[PDB]
Amino acid sequence: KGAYDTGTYANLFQRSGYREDEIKARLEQTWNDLFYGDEHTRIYYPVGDDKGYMLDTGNDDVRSEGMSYGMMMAVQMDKKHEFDRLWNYAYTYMQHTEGRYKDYFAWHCKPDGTRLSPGPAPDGEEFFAMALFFASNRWGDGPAPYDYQAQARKILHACLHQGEQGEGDPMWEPSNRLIKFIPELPFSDPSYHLPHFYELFAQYANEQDRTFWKEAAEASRAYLRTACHPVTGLSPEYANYDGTPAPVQLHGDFRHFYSDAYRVAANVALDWEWFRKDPWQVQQSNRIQAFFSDIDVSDYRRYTIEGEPFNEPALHPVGLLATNAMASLAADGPDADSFVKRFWNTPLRQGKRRYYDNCLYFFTMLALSGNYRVYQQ
Numbered sequence: 001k002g003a004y005d006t007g008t009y010a011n012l013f014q015r016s017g018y019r020e021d022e023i024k025a026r027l028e029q030t031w032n033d034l035f036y037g038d039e040h041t042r043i044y045y046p047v048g049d050d051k052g053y054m055l056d057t058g059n060d061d062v063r064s065e066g067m068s069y070g071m072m073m074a075v076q077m078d079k080k081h082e083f084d085r086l087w088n089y090a091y092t093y094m095q096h097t098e099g100r101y102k103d104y105f106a107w108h109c110k111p112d113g114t115r116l117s118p119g120p121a122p123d124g125e126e127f128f129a130m131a132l133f134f135a136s137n138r139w140g141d142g143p144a145p146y147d148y149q150a151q152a153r154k155i156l157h158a159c160l161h162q163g164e165q166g167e168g169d170p171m172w173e174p175s176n177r178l179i180k181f182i183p184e185l186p187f188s189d190p191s192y193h194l195p196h197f198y199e200l201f202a203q204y205a206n207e208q209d210r211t212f213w214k215e216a217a218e219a220s221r222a223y224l225r226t227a228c229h230p231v232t233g234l235s236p237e238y239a240n241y242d243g244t245p246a247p248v249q250l251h252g253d254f255r256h257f258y259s260d261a262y263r264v265a266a267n268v269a270l271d272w273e274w275f276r277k278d279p280w281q282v283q284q285s286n287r288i289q290a291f292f293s294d295i296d297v298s299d300y301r302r303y304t305i306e307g308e309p310f311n312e313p314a315l316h317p318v319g320l321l322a323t324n325a326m327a328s329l330a331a332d333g334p335d336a337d338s339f340v341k342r343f344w345n346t347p348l349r350q351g352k353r354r355y356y357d358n359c360l361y362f363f364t365m366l367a368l369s370g371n372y373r374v375y376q377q
């Protein structure tokens, strides 16, 4: 039985021997540094009285990924002021009010709110919806735009029904219940697959969609079993609907284990923690930990999914360590405890490339302290 059924969350830091008081002090310090830390560390920036953005420090833009990530961190940490600032920014500058992307979010804008491209990123929308359902369940709905449950339902309505609304496209392929990479293209990104969020969409979304979300949870669990390498546990950044690496795209080669794919190990582990439905998840978690058990974080490379290293280093090696450590929610092999301790002894990333590492780092600090929870009712 998972944490969803029992209400009890694994505290992997405590099980590894860290004191309960040092653990919550460490979680609170990680929040304080990431949202309000020094100019080399923070990724959150307040704007006026009622807005704020999560900065992709590397790309110098604001991404629906980072904004939605910030909202999840804020609601898990019970930080409504920051949540409402981030949400108002996304609502005000990023959410489309008309056209083929109506109710979707432009995937990135300039920090001043100027849209750079109108096309959305589905991992944004699904984090926005889940964080808004948790905000509703934790704090209750306020007046629009802080009518959190209705805002979440609106996003997920568009995700499934955009094709009925206008000339646009849904973010899930109706035939196989799989999340797509972008609405227009017939392939996926394994790191976008959140079966644990779809289980909760099957509870909280518009009634007419609840069967679909239930089927989407089952379909995504099955999809990750086809996408992850059976020896290494590594997955490609983009994958066909059959789980094989997608073709090289005009904008790059996404066939390998790099930035996006790191989140798969974390996503699988949190589904196991919450729902404990697919015991393959334990073996997948053991496999990726075994693959990296012997590899120093500073030596992390790009890898083919069969484990062949490139000369090229990982761009986000602290991010990779974070997702490898979060796999200890499911892994029961001989590496689980060492990854937890390695992670504990790893500080936040500083400087230009810090955004992606520090987002993954924070989700891992939440999950390993038993503080990445379902907020119900």
Ligand SMILES: O[C@@H]1[C@@H](O)[C@H](O)OC[C@H]1O
Binding pocket: 056, 058, 059, 063, 065, 259, 260, 315, 355, 356
């Ligand atoms: O937005 C992320 C970017 O900042 C990182 O560098 O690569 C992965 C992306 O998802």
